[PDB]
Structures are given as C-alpha cells and as structure tokens.
Amino acid sequence: LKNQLGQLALEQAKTFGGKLEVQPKVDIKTKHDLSIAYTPGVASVSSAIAKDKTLAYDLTTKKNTVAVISDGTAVLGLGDIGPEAAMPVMEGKAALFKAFAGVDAIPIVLDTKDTEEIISIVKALAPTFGGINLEDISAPRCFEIEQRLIKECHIPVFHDDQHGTAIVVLAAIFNSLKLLKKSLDEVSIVVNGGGSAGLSITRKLLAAGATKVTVVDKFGIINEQEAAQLAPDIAKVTNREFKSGTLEDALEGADIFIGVSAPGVLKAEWISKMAARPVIFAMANPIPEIYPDEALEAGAYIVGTGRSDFPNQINNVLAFPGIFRGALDARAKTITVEMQIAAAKGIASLVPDDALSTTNIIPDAFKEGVAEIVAKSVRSVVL
Amino acid sequence: LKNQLGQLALEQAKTFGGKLEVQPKVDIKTKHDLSIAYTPGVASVSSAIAKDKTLAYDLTTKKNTVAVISDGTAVLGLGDIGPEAAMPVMEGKAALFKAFAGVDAIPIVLDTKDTEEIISIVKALAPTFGGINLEDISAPRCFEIEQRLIKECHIPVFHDDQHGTAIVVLAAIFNSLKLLKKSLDEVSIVVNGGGSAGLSITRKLLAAGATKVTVVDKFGIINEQEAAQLAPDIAKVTNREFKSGTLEDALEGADIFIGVSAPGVLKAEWISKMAARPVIFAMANPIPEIYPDEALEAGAYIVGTGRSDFPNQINNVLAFPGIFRGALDARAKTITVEMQIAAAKGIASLVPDDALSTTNIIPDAFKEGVAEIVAKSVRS
Ligand SMILES: [Mg+2]
Numbered sequence: 001l002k003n004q005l006g007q008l009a010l011e012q013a014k015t016f017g018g019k020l021e022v023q024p025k026v027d028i029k030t031k032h033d034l035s036i037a038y039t040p041g042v043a044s045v046s047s048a049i050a051k052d053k054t055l056a057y058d059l060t061t062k063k064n065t066v067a068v069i070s071d072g073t074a075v076l077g078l079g080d081i082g083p084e085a086a087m088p089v090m091e092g093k094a095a096l097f098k099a100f101a102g103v104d105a106i107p108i109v110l111d112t113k114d115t116e117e118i119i120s121i122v123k124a125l126a127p128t129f130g131g132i133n134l135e136d137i138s139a140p141r142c143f144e145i146e147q148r149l150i151k152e153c154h155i156p157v158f159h160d161d162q163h164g165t166a167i168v169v170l171a172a173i174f175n176s177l178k179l180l181k182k183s184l185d186e187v188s189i190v191v192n193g194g195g196s197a198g199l200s201i202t203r204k205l206l207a208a209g210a211t212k213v214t215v216v217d218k219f220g221i222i223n224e225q226e227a228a229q230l231a232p233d234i235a236k237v238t239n240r241e242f243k244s245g246t247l248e249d250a251l252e253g254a255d256i257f258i259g260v261s262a263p264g265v266l267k268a269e270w271i272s273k274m275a276a277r278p279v280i281f282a283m284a285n286p287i288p289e290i291y292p293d294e295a296l297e298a299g300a301y302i303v304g305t306g307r308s309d310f311p312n313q314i315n316n317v318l319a320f321p322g323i324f325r326g327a328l329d330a331r332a333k334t335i336t337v338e339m340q341i342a343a344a345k346g347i348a349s350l351v352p353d354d355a356l357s358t359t360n361i362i363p364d365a366f367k368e369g370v371a372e373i374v375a376k377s378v379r380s381v382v383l
Numbered sequence: 384l385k386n387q388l389g390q391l392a393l394e395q396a397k398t399f400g401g402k403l404e405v406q407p408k409v410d411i412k413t414k415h416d417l418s419i420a421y422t423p424g425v426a427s428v429s430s431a432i433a434k435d436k437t438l439a440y441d442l443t444t445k446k447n448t449v450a451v452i453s454d455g456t457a458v459l460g461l462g463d464i465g466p467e468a469a470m471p472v473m474e475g476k477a478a479l480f481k482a483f484a485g486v487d488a489i490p491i492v493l494d495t496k497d498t499e500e501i502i503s504i505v506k507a508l509a510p511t512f513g514g515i516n517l518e519d520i521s522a523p524r525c526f527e528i529e530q531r532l533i534k535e536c537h538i539p540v541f542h543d544d545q546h547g548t549a550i551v552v553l554a555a556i557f558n559s560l561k562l563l564k565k566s567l568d569e570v571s572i573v574v575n576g577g578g579s580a581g582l583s584i585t586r587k588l589l590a591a592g593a594t595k596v597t598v599v600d601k602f603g604i605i606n607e608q609e610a611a612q613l614a615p616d617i618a619k620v621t622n623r624e625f626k627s628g629t630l631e632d633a634l635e636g637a638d639i640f641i642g643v644s645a646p647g648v649l650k651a652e653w654i655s656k657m658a659a660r661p662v663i664f665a666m667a668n669p670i671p672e673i674y675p676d677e678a679l680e681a682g683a684y685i686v687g688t689g690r691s692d693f694p695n696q697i698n699n700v701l702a703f704p705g706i707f708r709g710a711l712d713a714r715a716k717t718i719t720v721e722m723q724i725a726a727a728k729g730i731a732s733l734v735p736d737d738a739l740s741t742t743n744i745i746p747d748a749f750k751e752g753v754a755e756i757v758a759k760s761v762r763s
C-alpha cells in the first residue's frame with residue numbers, strides 16, 4: 001500500500017539519549033544528606049562490609065542489580081555489529097528487567113571478542129553485581145564463556161539467548177501435555193539439534209520427567225549402538241533407548257512432538273506419520289523449521305514458534321525476569337537446572353483454560369509466579 | 384568527635400539496599416510500548432548505530448552515563464579493603480553526579496589489582512560509557528592507571544582523587560588573588576606534600592601561570608640540585624628555582640601562599656614569618672594542618688579548609704560533577720589541564736567580587752556554570 005515500519009520511533013532514542021537512567025533512592029539534596037550518603041558516614045558502611053563481605057548483599061546495590069553483558073557479536077537478527085550498536089538492545093533488555101520484575105539491570109557492552117579475556121572481564125566485575133545475564137554473544141564462544149563463568153563465578157550467570165526460550169518451550173509442553181491427556185513419561189519426544197543447545201533442552205527434558213527422548217543431528221538419529229557418533233557419548237546413554245538407526249523422517253514415526261533448531265528441516269508430509277495429536281515447536285529464528293499454518297494442514301494439533309505473527313509464540317520475556325528475581329531474592333550463588341524447570345512450571349501455572357493459548361501473556365502476576373517457583377524449588381538444602 | 388553518628392545514623396543502605404536504582408526514561412507497560420523500546424523496533428536503532436558510530440553518543444545512554452570505577456584498594460581513609468566494601472563509596476560518588484550535575488553514573492568495582500588487567504578492563508567497557516571516573520585506587524599504581532587511560536581511551540578518563548580537590552583549591556586562589564590584587568606570577572607559593580594531590584596542585588598552578596612554587600615533603604624542600612629519582616617532567620626541575628633547599632619552616636619566609644595536603648603541622652608562629660597578607664589552605668582532615676581559628680589570630684589574611692565547619696570550605700563536589708557534565712556535553716576524548724583550569728575559573732566566577740568568602744557553595748546550576756566553562760574551552 002505504502003509501508004514504512006511505523007516502529008521508526010528511532011526518535012525515541014534521539015530524544016532521551018538512551019532509555020535508561022540512574023536515580024538515587026536516598027536523600028541527597030543537602031550537606032546533611034551528603035554526610036550520610038557519602039564522605040563522612042559512608043565510611044562505616046564500607047567498614048562493616050570489610051569485616052563481613054556477606055553484608056554486600058544487604059548494604060549495596062549488589063542486592064538487586066544484574067548486569068546485561070554482550071560483545072555485540074550476535075545482536076538480535078542482525079550480526080556482529082559491535083558493542084556500541086548493541087547498547088540499544090542491552091538497555092532495552094534492562095528496561096524489561098525492571099518493568100516486569102523489580103530487577104535493576106545495567107547494560108554493558110565490551111569490545112573484545114577474545115573468549116579468554118571476556119570471561120576474565122566479567123569475573124572481575126562479578127563483585128559489583130548480584131547477577132550476570134550474558135546476551136547476544138555468538139556461538140560457539142557463547143557456550144564456553146557461560147560454562148567457565150558459571151563454574152568460576154560466585155554469582156548466578158545465565159546466557160539468556162539459549163536457556164531462555166528453552167524454559168519457555170519446556171513450559172509450553174507442560175501445558176501441551178495437559179490438553180492431550182498424556183504424561184511426560186508416556187511421551188515420545190524428538191529433538192532436532194546435536195549442538196549444545198539441543199543437548200541442554202534434552203537434559204532439561206529428562207530432568208523434567210521425560211522418559212523417551214531421541215536426539216537428532218545433521219547426520220541422523222543419535223543411536224547408542226552405533227559408535228559412529230561424535231564425542232558428545234553421554235546423551236546416547238540416556239536417550240533413544242530403542243536404538244532406532246534411521247533419519248529425522250524416520251523419527252516422527254509415532255512421536256508425540258518435536259522440539260527443533262534447523263531451518264525448514266521438517267517437511268509437512270511427515271507430520272502425517274507422527275503420533276495422534278502431534279505438537280511441534282519450530283524454534284528456528286527467522287525461517288522456522290516449518291511455518292505453523294503450513295504444519296496445521298498436515299495434521300498437527302499444536303504449533304509454536306518464536307514468531308509474533310503466528311499463535312503460540314515462545315518468547316524469552318516470560319522467563320528471564322522471574323528467574324533472576326527469584327535467584328536474587330534467594331541470594332543464589334548460581335542458577336540450577338531444577339530452578340529452571342521450576343520457572344517452567346510457574347510459567348505453566350498462568351494458563352487457566354488452554355487451547356491455542358498454552359503460554360501465558362504478560363499479566364500482573366507473571367514474574368512473581370515465576371520467581372515464586374524459582375525460590376522454594378531450592379527445596380534441597382545441603383545440610 | 385564521636386559525633387560521626389551519621390555513619391550509623393544512616394544505614395539507609397539496609398533500608399534501601401544500596402543507594403542507587405535503574406529507571407527507564409521511556410514507556411513500557413503496553414505491548415505496543417515494548418514493540419518500540421525493544422523488538423523489533425529497537426532493531427532500527429542498532430542498525431543505524433552500526434552504520435554510524437558517532438550515533439552512539441546520540442541514541443544510547445552513553446550520551447550521559449559515566450562509570451565510577453575502583454579496585455577497592457584505597458577507599459576513603461580505610462586503605463585496601465576490597466571491591467565489595469568499596470561499593471558503598473562508589474554508590475555515593477555516583478549519586479553525587481546525578482544530584483549536582485545531570486550526569487548518570489554507574490558504580491563498578493573490580494576483583495583484581497594487576498595494573499594491566501585494570502587498564503584493559505576499562506578499555507573493554509568504555510564503549511558503554513561516555514566518561515570514566517577512577518576513584519579510590521592507590522598509588523603508585525593509580526598513576527600508571529590514569530596516565531595510560533588518558534592516552535589510550537576514546538572517552539575521557541579521570542581520577543578525581545588526585546586532581547579534584549586540586550582544582551577547587553585553584554578556584555580558591557584565583558579569587559584570593561583578587562582581594563590581594565597580585566598576579567599569580569608575583570606570588571610566592573609553598574606546597575606541603577609531595578604526594579599525588581600535592582603534585583596535581585603544583586602542576587595546575589604552573590599551567591595557570593605560577594612562576595614561584597616550591598614543594599616540601601617528608602624531608603624538606605624539594606631541591607632540583609639535591610633530588611634523585613628512580614627513572615628521571617619531574618617536579619624537581621619545575622620548582623624551587625632559587626635552588627634553595629632547607630626546612631619546611633625555613634621556606635615559608637615571606638611566602639604569600641601555602642597549600643597543605645595531609646599532615647597537621649603548620650605552627651601559628653610561622654605566619655608572621657610569611658608575607659604581609661598570607662593565605663592558608665589547610666586541606667588535611669579530619670585534622671587540618673591548622674585550624675582557621677589560630678590562623679586568623681596569628682595574622683593570616685585568608686583561610687580555607689576541607690571543613691564545612693568553617694568559612695571557605697574547599698570541597699570536591701564543586702569540581703567533578705561539572706567537569707564531566709561538560710566533557711560529555713561537548714563529547715571530549717580527554718580531560719585536559721586546560722579543561723581543569725577552565726573548571727576552576729568557572730567555579731571562582733560563581734562568587735561575584737568576593738570577600739573572605741573566596742568560594743561558592745552549591746546554589747542552582749553550579750555544575751552548569753562549570754560545565755559551560757569546560758565545554759566551549761575544548762571547542763578550539
Ligand atoms: Mg538476545
């Protein structure tokens with residue numbers, strides 16, 4: 001007709017010079033106020049902490065502030081555009097942290113693509129924050145940085161662009177299970193993705209209950225009795241325990257649903273051969289594994305993607321706010337796997353009467369619930 | 384004075400859990416609002432900046448956010464207490480930026496002390512800010528830290544601890560030079576303290592137009608023909624040109640100006656031995672080199688300290704907020720001495736033809752009058 005974008009509110013950046021601001025929540029207009037918030041008195045706040053470093057959580061902003069960190073190598077659906085160009089997205093991300101949950105998030109972009117010094121930069125920042133949210137950093141550097149950070153840090157580190165949608169996909173099935181009348185131990189789950197992402201989802205699924213999961217990569221089914229699969233040996237042991245040695249196509253065969261990661265790899269015809277009420281989660285960016293409508297006429301009962309135009313969008317938003325709010329509230333030295341499933345159930349709890357509506361919208365509770373579950377899911381005291 | 388009940392009569396830190404918080408400057412609360420501040424509208428902002436980097440100063444908070452960075456190694460008067468314990472001080476310093484000037488500031492502490500590590504950390508995060516304020520990191524490392532950053536960063540890096548207080552004292556003497564009606568070229572200046580702050584004072588006076596400055600330290604007058612260093616630019620060759628080396632006492636002889644940094648000495652009997660109308664800036668604290676009381680008794684023309692307790696209090700809050708407000712409003716890549724001197728000149732002007740009230744307090748737009756002087760002074 002005569003299209004543009006509309007969302008050309010680029011003037012919204014120009015006008016306010018960014019989208020975040022730092023406000024003191026303490027009195028500071030007078031000499032009396034400054035003798036309390038700074039110079040004289042403040043010396044004793046430092047002192048208490050110097051004797052008991054745990055006090056950092058009660059007397060500093062480490063209590064409620066998380067850092068959103070990126071190197072601008074994987075910003076959104078663009079590309080390695082650099083740290084400055086990434087800032088709009090990291091501070092946008094931080095504005096959500098505050099709006100949906102009560103989390104104070106500082107956006108931070110560093111210009112270094114050297115894995116070694118990135119994990120070393122953040123480790124040095126760790127003292128400052130109560131939580132680290134790695135964002136938009138490209139793979140495979142995005143997997144080693146997180147693991148070395150999770151292991152070496154005293155505060156929770158969460159790479160959102162990975163476990164994020166995973167947690168929402170996990171919640172999307174809990175609700176999918178319900179309207180099918182099946183359990184998670186009766187479901188035949190096929191995961192397309194040998195990468196670390198597909199593997200994580202898989203670990204999560206087994207931890208969530210799932211009895212039978214078959215993993216598939218670019219060369220076929222991961223079968224344990226076919227020592228013809230990469231040194232990533234372990235998933236073989238706990239998935240595909242019937243040992244079907246075939247292909248993706250040969251996997252839909254009576255499968256209750258597929259979780260994916262590769263572009264258009266799922267051709268409609270197959271759907272026909274899937275189980276009775278076939279669920280489908282084509283999470284592949286831009287070009288999904290199969291467009292929702294294009295997969296409904298095939299015979300699918302449920303379809304979800306990461307696209308706003310189709311129904312059932314699996315979006316990060318329903319997860320990162322609550323998880324850190326819950327983690328911060330508990331002063332968790334790290335985010336566990338059970339904590340992530342906890343988040344998935346909470347998210348799940350927000351859907352009363354489902355159908356074509358299995359993932360909750362953005363209501364009032366929706367971060368509180370999630371944070372509620374994350375805390376209490378810690379029902380495993382080492383004492 | 385146990386009167387420091389504030390130190391306790393505060394613990395707002397516990398009530399508020401820290402003194403700062405992050406707030407959005409734009410709309411959220413509806414899907415449509417989110418549509419613009421985030422995906423997929425924000426994608427046009429990223430892309431635009433990707434094609435023109437000088438836009439980072441226009442469309443991101445970099446346009447107004449400076450980071451207050453320290454390694455918790457020299458936190459106000461407590462030494463090396465670590466990053467977590469330094470955080471309260473950086474939170475307060477950051478609050479001040481917002482309170483006096485418009486500057487948004489973020490406190491950031493670091494778990495390392497290796498110089499090379501620190502410099503490279505700041506280089507990694509600059510992208511994110513428009514200015515860096517080093518604070519409470521100790522010497523002699525802070526020296527290499529700041530100096531390397533100044534000439535290796537695209538955004539201005541400053542260490543408020545060694546220059547801030549220096550700048551205000553300068554502001555004070557520009558004005559005192561008026562009541563005295565003498566040229567900053569004619570005055571004989573003595574500076575007690577050969578440390579970080581000490582030097583920053585001299586270095587500024589010698590750029591502001593001082594011809595007679597002599598520095599004294601732990602052993603006495605620094606004498607160019609006596610001094611010896613472990614590198615050998617140095618203070619020695621730009622001071623004590625009379626080559627007169629002696630005591631810190633046998634040197635205030637008819638001196639018109641004294642700036643003291645961190646002792647508590649300076650005896651009342653010495654005043655009269657100075658020039659006819661001497662000025663005393665006793666900057667040590669809590670205990671000054673000499674209380675204003677005695678100074679005036681002893682026959683001193685003007686006196687100022689680092690005490691809100693007496694008149695002429697020379698305090699930091701007058702310098703850094705405005706020098707960053709302006710080194711940002713004008714988008715500068717460095718904070719130079721010219722800018723610093725300009726900062727002080729601005730400060731002094733906040734007092735229309737003075738008296739024994741050589742400095743300004745904290746009225747309205749103080750940080751602006753100074754920002755206005757620093758910016759437009761780099762425009763050259
Ligand atoms: Mg992302």
Ligand SMILES: [Mg+2]
Nearest residue numbers: 459518519544
């Ligand atoms: Mg300091």
